[PDB]
Write a protein that binds this ligand. Sequence first.
Ligand SMILES: Nc1nc(-c2ccc(Cc3ccccc3)cc2)cs1
Ligand SMILES: [Yb+3]
Ligand SMILES: [Yb+3]
Ligand SMILES: [Yb+3]
Ligand SMILES: [Yb+3]
Ligand SMILES: [Zn+2]
Length: 607
Amino acid sequence: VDTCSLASPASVCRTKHLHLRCSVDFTRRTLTGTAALTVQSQEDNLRSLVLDTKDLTIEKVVINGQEVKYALGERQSYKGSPMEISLPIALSKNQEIVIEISFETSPKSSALQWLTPEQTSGKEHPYLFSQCQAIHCRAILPCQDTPSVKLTYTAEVSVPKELVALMSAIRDGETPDPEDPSRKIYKFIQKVPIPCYLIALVVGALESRQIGPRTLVWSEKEQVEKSAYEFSETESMLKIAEDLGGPYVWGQYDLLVLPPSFPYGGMENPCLTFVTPTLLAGDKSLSNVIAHEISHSWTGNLVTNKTWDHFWLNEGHTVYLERHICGRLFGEKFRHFNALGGWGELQNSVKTFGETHPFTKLVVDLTDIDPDVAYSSVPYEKGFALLFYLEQLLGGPEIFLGFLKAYVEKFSYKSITTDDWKDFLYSYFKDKVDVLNQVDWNAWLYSPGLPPIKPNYDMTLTNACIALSQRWITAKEDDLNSFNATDLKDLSSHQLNEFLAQTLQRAPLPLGHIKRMQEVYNFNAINNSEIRFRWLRLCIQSKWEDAIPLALKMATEQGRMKFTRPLFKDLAAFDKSHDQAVRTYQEHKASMHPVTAMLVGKDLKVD
Ligand SMILES: Nc1nc(-c2ccc(Cc3ccccc3)cc2)cs1
Ligand SMILES: [Yb+3]
Ligand SMILES: [Yb+3]
Ligand SMILES: [Yb+3]
Ligand SMILES: [Yb+3]
Ligand SMILES: [Zn+2]
């Protein structure tokens, strides 16, 4: 059972299909409509079932053309309110019925951000976007909000006719709304079964540009040109991914570049990956995020975690595939550079949380934990480290890629646990069971901290970054004149970021050093978000007041949690900026994404 859901479990019943008809009302910040669930019993004599909801208003439930009884339970904090529905006839095993729920969302839906015109690029039209992962689909529509259940869906969405709707589905046309001449209906079909967390909706003044044979990029007009160039490697990456995972089953692979408040780097919504506009570096250098989202089309979207306790299955295997895509494009030594950088990020996470912190375990027990509070890079990097260790133990990357492809084929269209995965690993590698039995499984899967063994990493591309960082760290005042813009001449953007990450791991540095760094390298001019982020953190943690306005601007003019959360934490920890940071958060809170607003507030102990 999934401890994060209040619905009937998949052993009682399973939703097979959703037909969603809804209208997006910007004046009331609500979605209103009907969710028709086709539900298949998995037990004899099924007479009622329970769905997840959060802040939903229910108008009626109709089964076989008649209204039926239902009841909402007491709220269970972030889990929401269970909804019990009484069936009009009892179902046998495998019998199906269609349940049509009439509902309305709350303006405070934790799934949604509603933007006024002034919060958009274009300034003339409002905007809406969803983010359902992990357990926010229940704040859009009543459902079994667990990744253990997979369903196809169709949808018809009425919007103001000047705007465009897109969903995590194949576009299936548009028509005027026959009931309202100010509106247009956009239609969608998702024929591949998905977990409900992959349901997505955006409505705004969106334009599209074709960038490959099965890819459009979508954004407000102002960002289309830049996005189309930034993501032009998309089709090449899809072809690599198909070689590694097997056929891409989803038809279209579109990209939507969201407003700056999108909380994540990307989200793997099927047929319509969502990405942060913080990726628009100008040089394609943050394209690993696109590789990552592409990879989810196999690991996550085809083979899915059964509950959120096993999230590392989704992320670790995706990061493993991502790094192979970027290794195929730019070489194996680049794969190792990225892998090593990930170990660094894991070190950072373990130091921040503490080496005994339960959120440093690979398998977590989220029973009474808001999944959004648990989120971190641990499942990503500890998960990747496990897989990279296994690759190295079991004969190298070609061998382990064989396992990955077999794993995806085995569990396609299924939801699985860590034990499912481990059993399949032992089956696939049964001729190497003696090797597998050297792994300290309990440590790797269930213990906090750094993993018990560190993989081997090629250092070729890292050495220049380490050498320059060590020069700065060991420099005294009288050595500062020795640094020059020529120090950077043979570093890629990726190496510049790694130099800053290496250096930030040793922060603070003396204030004079940081001042000299800006004087010779002019890092303040760099627009790349990753580089800028680490540079500003370095400056704040080294107590440079000149960086306060820069860091406050970055923290509030975008909302990617990876950047915003630590920028706010560093600004709150610097006495010179503490007041301004708390004030700035409180003033921006109403305009923030609800989840990022919640988490910043927790971090700051404010509000
Ligand atoms: N240290 C570990 N943390 C996790 C974990 C982290 C977060 C979630 C849920 C989640 C998943 C994706 C976006 C928001 C919330 C599930 C599991 C898994 S292992
Ligand atoms: Yb029966
Ligand atoms: Yb069609
Ligand atoms: Yb087992
Ligand atoms: Yb000296
Ligand atoms: Zn991911």
